[model samples]
Target: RRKPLFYTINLIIPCVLITSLAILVFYLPSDCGEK
Candidate 1:
């Protein structure tokens, strides 16, 4: 049970980080450009 929980967290953390980074990378400059 502990192992599975660790594995799940490992998988999910990177995925969420990557998704957030991608969103910021694409959106931040675009919004700045409008100003």
Candidate 2:
């Protein structure tokens, strides 16, 4: 069905956002004191 691709994009975008944010958290400096 045509719905398959649409559903995949919706899922993939949020997944990437979550992963990127997780990576970004570790990418920051250790002395920023954001915690």
Candidate 3:
């Protein structure tokens, strides 16, 4: 149980981080440039 939770967290954290980073990289710069 504990191991599974740890594995899930490890996987989910990176996925979320990468997704957020990608969104930021692609969208934030455009918004900034527009302003």
Candidate 4:
């Protein structure tokens, strides 16, 4: 027999990581020495 799976975690992890990074950057002050 054969089975199929969604493999959502593979997409979820990277999506979550990028979302979290964006949020963190959004909260950072402009004067934090970043261009």
- TM-score of each candidate structure, all chains considered together: 0.50, 0.45, 0.50, 0.47
Q: How well does candidate 4 match the true structure, expressed as C-alpha RMSD?
A: 7.5
**Cα lDDT tens digits for candidate 1, 1-35:** 46544554558888888989998886765635554
Per-model CA lDDT versus the true structure: 0.71, 0.72, 0.72, 0.71
Cand. 4 Cα-lDDT: 0.71
lDDT of 3 by residue, 5-30 (tens): 35545588888899999988767766
lDDT of 4 by residue, 1-35 (tens): 23565454558778988988898897765656765
Candidate 1: stretches off by over 4 Å: 1-10, 29-35
Model 1 earns a TM-score of 0.50
Clashing pairs in 3: none
Per-residue lDDT of 26 in model 3: 69
lDDT of 2 by residue, 4-23 (tens): 54554558788888988887
User: RMSD of candidate 1 to the true fold?
Assistant: 4.9
Total backbone collisions for each predicted model: 0, 0, 0, 0
